[PDB]
RNA sequence: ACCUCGAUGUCGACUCAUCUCAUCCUCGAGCUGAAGCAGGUUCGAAGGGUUCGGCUGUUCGCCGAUUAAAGAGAUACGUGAGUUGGGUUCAAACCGUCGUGAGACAGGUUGGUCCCUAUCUAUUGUGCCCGUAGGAAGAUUGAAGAGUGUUGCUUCUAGUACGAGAGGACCGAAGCGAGGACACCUCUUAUGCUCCAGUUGUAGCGCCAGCUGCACCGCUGGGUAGUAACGUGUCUAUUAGAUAAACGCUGAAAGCAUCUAAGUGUGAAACUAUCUCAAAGAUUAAUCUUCCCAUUUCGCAAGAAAGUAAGAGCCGUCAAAGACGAUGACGUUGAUAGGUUACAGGUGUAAGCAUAGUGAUAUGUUGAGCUGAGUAAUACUAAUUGCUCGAGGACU
RNA sequence: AGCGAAAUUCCUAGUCGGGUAAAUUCCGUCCCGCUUGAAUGGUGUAACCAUCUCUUGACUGUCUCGGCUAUAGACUCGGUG
RNA sequence: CAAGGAACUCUGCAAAUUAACCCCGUAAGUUAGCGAGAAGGGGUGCUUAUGUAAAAGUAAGCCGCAGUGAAGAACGAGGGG
């Protein structure tokens, strides 16, 4: 019959967040995950900067990295995922919204903040 | 993606330097490596003051893969190295110091000695 | 096959669309291949749309698909454009060009169509 | 490949039977009286009532 | 009878978070309350079935015999006509919504005419290997492989029937089972089904009852955001 | 030496397999010098599949680690008008030997050219014509069919039994995987040539700036739709019958005994239906429903001119389609496509301007500007105010 | 004499060693040389070989493991053929 | 083109990597020529100044993910015959 391709968002409205911080390419943020076990749900704090943001709807994702014991680990996270907590502390100064080059660049990979 | 003939690292202090996968456990040509899977390796480089010397064939478990894998929680984690932990024919590992990150897809598989002796769980 | 004419690359398509857009806005009528027109009209009326704002940056933009012709030069032809064709169709939304197929060729029976612009 | 036995006249006929062509459309042009093909231009040039091409 | 069915259109596919912390792939199907247009009895008509109709449009576009049959039956003039074999749970002159018929915890079967593709190669269709390149490959190095069976007059001298040969892929009904039901929309009347659906974008879909596990009903509930700063 | 020396390309391997059981296995049963456990023999069962390497040109062969399992074999020791060649198998030769001599080695070694534009048949799709006894439109069942049924690990049942101690279950359930088959691009990627940003050299657009041409799309970093995957999602069941090897109940001939001679049972992933898809050219041309029409006047004894108003075809717009045809939707009674606008998304802070700054540069204008294909409105334009075939229910 | 299972071996996949996960080819070594063997030369040899072979460092689409992008084809149309 | 780096193969065929400038550094062998550009290194943009004749050199700042940014540029090592 009559097609919308817009009701996708309407049915995705059932899972939305009402805070939604800003993230483009340089936000130094620590993210918390409510890891659920049989008892005493743990709260993990994972810090790092964001490389690039991709999204169309509920499918909104961002990147975040840590470096512990010399080993770096990078993880993607969907924004509208429950059991996740985001608390921003630094806004950075970047040139392009899509950057990925920390994968190769060595130590002292930090970036100056947005003055 | 990570498989046979892959010189990987070691995530443990065992007096070894370099090790290569020799075969993957599993029937009907598994031929692929995934996180938490028990595999068999052979040391290629090791220190003279270590427990193993080159030519020894041992069994290990991959802890970190360069490509990583998607987790059932709905998130996917990427690693930046390829390391394995050595296990001495039982549920106890060969080593005595687990340093660095380790995959969480192996907690339900047992081998909790590494988990309790791990510096961190991710 | 192997080494031959450089083929019908996308650069060829850009060169063509530039050439017959300049040709049509130069005189106002072209008989050409059907599909060449069919994918040209879009660029035609997109340029017509962006030219009805009369901004220096939009003019910088419309310089990017025009070359000189045998009758006027780029500056005079774009002045002619802004002077009469944009004031003509400022009101109506869309429909900035028309095409109607011509007869089959005696040679290869290829699809000619006449492209023109009027009210 | 290469033929082994010669193709017969009636195989040639049956292969040619589907190797033919059909007729074409046709229509009447009101203003320029001419039996033109449908959805094409006329002898005087008006595909519809519109004739931007030269009448020559 | 016990295996029910309904007609839909795949209008998209999404991801929805679920209980036990799993991101389940979801597909949204637009499903109107379809119009029954005839019932066939297992005894008098020798087999039970239900003729179903949907996608009603203006009567002007429809062809004369179909609209005449509809006017004789006195129901809505629709363009989409089909059948469902052995479904007799309802009666004539009724519009059925899957929300009232299907469960939010039932395992279902899904069939759909697959995506039209044209002619396909054997490598794509039966997952054959692609020949190597080094040591001399020959310009044929990626094809359907060997078809030889026998050489010599009394060995085979024949091509088998059912030989694995490149042909046309897609545009046929595919069977996937054990799909879950998560979400209902009544104002827009959409159904959310776990997994994905074959075929191209915007195809007609059979949502049918799973034969293997028709009686199983397990609950899968959602999550609620409770954060604000 | 019988086809065959006026040609049967003469070892594999690579991919691709097909077929039999003179079973590799999981399957079932019988028997044991079968405590359990692990076994060994035999029968039936071929439904499914049955590794990666090292040497060697490789078969065979052995070695290393797996794996429930590394089968037996054949199909010109399978397969080049699918690939190519490691050498036997043209010379060029080299080494050892034989021979006075050229030469010779199923002696070894080095390098050593593989043609074919499918005519028939058969195969996968695909169409036109006609057909099935008025035509069209739908919906159909299905005789014959096709694909398909692999299981591993862990835990508990339970250290219960067996057993003496060690050792250590079968019946079942659950969970977790391997391989394969079935789709998708929502997570993940990879490509993504009329997309975005940057950047160099040069030729230019009269100078600067801003853009274009070539330099692999010049390059770099990405990315729309799309396409696929290494990614997700699904699956390997389960039921009933006939059963096979088998164990029987009852019970005779053969008074006891006996699974058989009467009746009758349970019993295998084998078999059949059930699992999934096509399927009336199945001429045995099958079923149902609906619509359209059935129309003065005759023969070589008769249905001759309005030939539907049903529809189909011609043509166009296109694409959930598409080698082309066809397929699917739409043609002023239309949003079918194109266009405009709007949105989403992506790139990323456009140009221009002011200031700091003599200078690269930075800040504000700014999440600005731009965007090929995504999304919806919108007759603004193109699909015309068109043409052809096509209406008498025959017969007993 | 030198050297040697090597372009030299038939019994051989000869003994063992060295590296190699696992070595008929790779390196060394034993000497019984069916017949090595000295100007048909032989034993070693620096550079070099569009030379033969082996191991190893980086490197990857040869392979697991395929898919894409545009062309020139094929394909369709028109023309000779 | 994700990911391994030789697992296909008789051979790393091909493919891939390196690439030029300047200045570091370069074993053994040995006939003292070489090896050798051995190997193994670093860096090359713009603006200003120091700058000589231009060019190198240097100082300071700045842009960018990376700057012979585009193209034109030996991949080596060991060992055996």
UniProtKB/Swiss-Prot annotation, chain A:
One of its GO terms (molecular function) is structural constituent of ribosome. GO terms for cellular component: cytosolic large ribosomal subunit. One of its GO terms (biological process) is translation. Coiled coil: none annotated. The keyword Calcium does not apply. SUPFAM superfamilies: Translation proteins SH3-like domain. Gene3D superfamilies: 2.30.30.790. Keywords: Ribonucleoprotein, Ribosomal protein. The keyword DNA-binding does not apply. HAMAP family: Ribosomal_bL19. This protein is located at the 30S-50S ribosomal subunit interface and may play a role in the structure and function of the aminoacyl-tRNA binding site. Belongs to the bacterial ribosomal protein bL19 family. This is Large ribosomal subunit protein bL19.
Curated annotation (Swiss-Prot), chain B:
SMART domains: Ribosomal_L14. It comes from Mycoplasma pneumoniae (strain ATCC 29342 / M129 / Subtype 1) (Mycoplasmoides pneumoniae). Binds to 23S rRNA. Forms part of two intersubunit bridges in the 70S ribosome. One of its GO terms (cellular component) is cytosolic large ribosomal subunit. Keywords: Ribonucleoprotein, Ribosomal protein, RNA-binding, rRNA-binding. Coiled coil: none annotated. InterPro entries: Ribosomal_uL14, Ribosomal_uL14_bac-type, Ribosomal_uL14_CS, Ribosomal_uL14_sf. Part of the 50S ribosomal subunit. Forms a cluster with proteins L3 and L19. In the 70S ribosome, L14 and L19 interact and together make contacts with the 16S rRNA in bridges B5 and B8. One of its GO terms (molecular function) is large ribosomal subunit rRNA binding. It holds the Pfam family Ribosomal_L14. Belongs to the universal ribosomal protein uL14 family. SUPFAM superfamilies: Ribosomal protein L14. This is Large ribosomal subunit protein uL14. One of its GO terms (biological process) is translation.
UniProtKB/Swiss-Prot annotation, chain C:
Keywords: Ribonucleoprotein, Ribosomal protein. The keyword Transcription does not apply. InterPro entries: Ribosomal_bL17 (IPR000456), Ribosomal_bL17_CS (IPR047859), Ribosomal_bL17_sf (IPR036373). GO terms for cellular component: cytosolic large ribosomal subunit. The keyword Repeat does not apply. One of its GO terms (biological process) is translation. GO terms for molecular function: structural constituent of ribosome. It holds the Pfam family Ribosomal_L17. PANTHER family: LARGE RIBOSOMAL SUBUNIT PROTEIN BL17M, RIBOSOMAL PROTEIN L17. NCBIfam families: L17. Belongs to the bacterial ribosomal protein bL17 family. Part of the 50S ribosomal subunit. Contacts protein L32. This is Large ribosomal subunit protein bL17. The gene is rplQ.
Curated annotation (Swiss-Prot), chain D:
GO terms for biological process: translation. One of its GO terms (cellular component) is large ribosomal subunit. Keywords: Ribonucleoprotein, Ribosomal protein. Residues 6-17 have a biased composition (Basic residues). Residues 1-20 are annotated as: Disordered. Pfam families: Ribosomal_L32p (PF01783). One of its GO terms (molecular function) is structural constituent of ribosome. PANTHER family: 50S RIBOSOMAL PROTEIN L32, LARGE RIBOSOMAL SUBUNIT PROTEIN BL32. HAMAP family: Ribosomal_bL32 (MF_00340). Belongs to the bacterial ribosomal protein bL32 family. This is Large ribosomal subunit protein bL32. The gene is rpmF.
């Amino acid at each position: 019959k009559i097609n919308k391709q817009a009701l996708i968002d309407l049915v995705e409205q059932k899972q939305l967040k009402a805070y939604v911080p800003e993230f483009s390419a340089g936000d130094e943020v620590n993210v918390a995950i409510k890891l659920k076990e049989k008892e005493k749900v743990r709260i993990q704090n994972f810090t790092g900067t964001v490389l690039r943001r991709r999204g169309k709807g509920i499918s909104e994702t961002f990147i975040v990295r840590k470096t512990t014991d010399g080993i770096p680990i990078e993880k993607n996270f969907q924004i509208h995922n429950p059991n996740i907590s985001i608390e921003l502390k630094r806004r950075g100064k970047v040139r392009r919204a899509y950057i990925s080059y920390m994968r190769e660049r060595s130590g002292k990979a930090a970036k100056i903040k947005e003055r | 993606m990570v498989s046979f003939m892959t010189r990987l690292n070691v995530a443990d202090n065992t007096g070894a330097k370099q090790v290569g996968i020799i075969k993957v456990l599993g029937s009907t040509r598994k031929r692929y490596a995934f996180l938490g899977d028990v595999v068999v390796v052979s040391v290629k480089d090791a220190i003279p003051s270590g427990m193993v010397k080159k030519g020894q064939v041992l069994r290990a478990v991959i802890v970190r893969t360069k490509k990583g894998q998607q987790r059932k929680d709905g998130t996917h984690l990427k690693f930046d190295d390829n390391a394995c932990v050595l296990i001495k024919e039982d549920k106890s590992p060969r080593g005595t110091r687990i340093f660095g990150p380790v995959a969480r897809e192996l907690r339900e598989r047992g081998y909790n000695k590494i988990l309790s002796l791990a510096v961190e769980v991710v | 096959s192997y080494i031959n004419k450089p083929g019908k690359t996308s650069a060829w398509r850009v060169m063509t669309v530039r050439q017959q857009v300049s040709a049509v806005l130069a005189y106002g009528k072209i008989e050409t291949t059907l599909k060449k027109a069919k994918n040209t009209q879009k660029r035609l009326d997109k340029l017509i749309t962006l030219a009805k704002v009369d901004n220096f940056n939009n003019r910088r933009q419309v310089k990017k698909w025009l070359l000189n012709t045998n009758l006027f030069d780029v500056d005079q032809l774009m002045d002619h454009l802004f002077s009469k064709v944009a004031p003509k169709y400022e009101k109506t939304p869309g429909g900035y060009s028309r095409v109607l197929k011509l007869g089959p060729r005696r040679g290869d029976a290829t699809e000619m169509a006449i492209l023109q612009l009027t009210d | 490949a290469v033929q082994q036995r010669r193709s017969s006249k009636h195989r040639r006929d049956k292969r040619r039977s589907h190797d033919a062509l059909t007729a074409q459309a046709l229509s009447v042009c009101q203003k320029c009286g001419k039996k033109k093909l449908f959805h094409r231009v006329c002898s005087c040039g008006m595909y519809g009532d519109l004739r931007v091409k030269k009448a020559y | 009878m016990e295996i029910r069915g309904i007609f839909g259109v795949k209008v998209g596919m999404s991801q929805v978070f679920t209980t036990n912390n799993e991101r389940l792939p979801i597909t949204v199907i637009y499903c109107e309350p379809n119009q029954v247009a005839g019932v066939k009895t297992e005894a008098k008509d020798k087999y039970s079935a239900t003729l179903l109709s949907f996608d009603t449009v203006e009567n002007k576009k429809l062809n004369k015999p179909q609209q005449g049959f509809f006017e004789k039956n006195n129901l809505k003039p629709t363009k989409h006509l089909q059948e469902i074999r052995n479904m007799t749970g309802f009666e004539m002159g009724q519009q059925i919504t899957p929300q009232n018929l299907f469960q939010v915890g039932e395992y279902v079967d899904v069939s759909a005419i697959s995506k039209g593709r044209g002619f396909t190669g054997a490598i794509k269709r039966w997952n054959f290997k692609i020949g190597p390149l080094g040591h001399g490959a020959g310009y044929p190095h990626r094809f359907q492989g060997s078809v030889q069976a026998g050489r010599g007059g009394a060995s085979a001298q024949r091509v088998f029937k059912g030989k694995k040969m490149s042909g046309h892929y897609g545009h046929e009904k595919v069977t996937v089972q054990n799909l879950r039901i998560v979400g209902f929309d009544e104002a827009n009347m959409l159904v959310l089904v776990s997994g994905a659906i074959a075929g191209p974008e915007g195809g007609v879909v059979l949502i049918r009852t799973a034969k293997k596990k028709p009686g199983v009903v397990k609950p899968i509930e959602l999550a609620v955001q409770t954060e604000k700063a």
